[PDB]
Amino acid sequence: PREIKTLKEFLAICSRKDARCVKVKHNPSATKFKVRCSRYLYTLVVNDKKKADKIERS
Amino acid sequence: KRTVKMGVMGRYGTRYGANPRKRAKKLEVSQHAKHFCSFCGKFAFRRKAVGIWRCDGCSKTVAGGAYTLSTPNNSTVRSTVRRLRELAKI
């Protein structure tokens, strides 16, 4: 599993065609974005209100 | 000054008799002894196997001699070669 260190490349590889699911996660001290592609899962963990922003639409 | 009389052969103690130990001691003390390499200059030959001598400092393997580097009839052979090269050319 890779962890997208980007808001552009992530929103690119997160908005791809595989997109088995996007499991919204809430954990202590962060908010994690699990996109499930066919062969990896790419995470984008963030510490900001930007979690709820890109949660509604992505 | 440990082991005043029979040296390297202290490995055996009472066994094997005095003279077989003493004849084999002369040849056990030389195969473990570092020899000189007319190549690197400094004493570096160990005895990686019977009739095989390696020089770490020289990084080259001379062959010859089972328990020494040069059997003292190769010492005569090695000269007779050039003896029968140079004088047999000039």
């Binding site: - | 007319s38 190549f39 690197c40 200059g41 400094k42």
Partner: protein, 75 residues
């Protein structure tokens, strides 16, 4: 007179021995005389011989083992 032709060479200055450094003295062209011990492999006992015949330097072969000696001052 190898040890003698080289004795006062030590009484002069900038004694230098060593294969790698006996060439640093040839590139930066300040090597009066170079000596090659006759117990050296015919590669850089044939490469430093290439430099002395490339820069018209003198050579000498005589026989802390000293394998090469390149001097800048004479005596």
């Amino acid at each position: 007179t190898i040890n003698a032709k080289l004795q006062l060479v030590m009484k002069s200055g900038k004694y230098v021995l060593g294969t790698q450094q006996a060439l640093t003295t040839l590139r930066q062209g300040r090597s009066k005389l170079i000596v090659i011990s006759n117990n050296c492999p015919p590669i850089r006992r044939a490469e430093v011989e290439y430099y002395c015949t490339l820069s018209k330097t003198p050579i000498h072969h005589y026989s802390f083992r000293t394998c090469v000696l390149s001097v800048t001052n004479v005596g």
